[PDB]
């Protein structure tokens, strides 16, 4: 998960990465609009330096939604499962 891509012009995150926290995960309490990313996920393309391409989880919705909780669990396969609870 990559951090929020801060805009060098205003030293603030862009409108798309505005709701992301320092760790790139959207924090509860804020409102999510249409075409906004919740997890700035980047995955390698090799499977010498790894080449990560971004595949963020954009929110498809006509109306706004508020993040209530963000649960992060770890499975036995070292896989991190992130669940964000949107409310309307």
């Amino acid at each position: 998960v990559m951090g929020p891509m801060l805009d060098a012009a205003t030293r603030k995150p862009i409108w798309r990465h505005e709701i992301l926290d320092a760790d790139g995960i959207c924090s509860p309490g804020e409102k999510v609009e249409n075409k906004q990313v919740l997890v700035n996920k980047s995955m390698p393309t090799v499977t010498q330096q790894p080449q990560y391409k971004d595949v963020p989880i954009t929110y498809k919705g006509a109306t706004d939604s508020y993040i209530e909780k963000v649960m992060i669990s770890s499975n036995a396969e070292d896989a991190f499962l992130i669940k964000m609870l949107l409310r309307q």
Partner: protein, 50 residues
Amino acid sequence: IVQDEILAHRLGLIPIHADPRLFEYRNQGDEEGTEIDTLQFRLQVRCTRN
């Protein structure tokens, strides 16, 4: 545990004893509010064990 929107709705449903004749309607926009047409009520409650 109460949702933020439900809490805001309940707070909006609370009446205010302020006299409306001494105030005026807020113009289009101006979310900052002016001293003439706005009232501020702070609510800070921290629950803890006795």
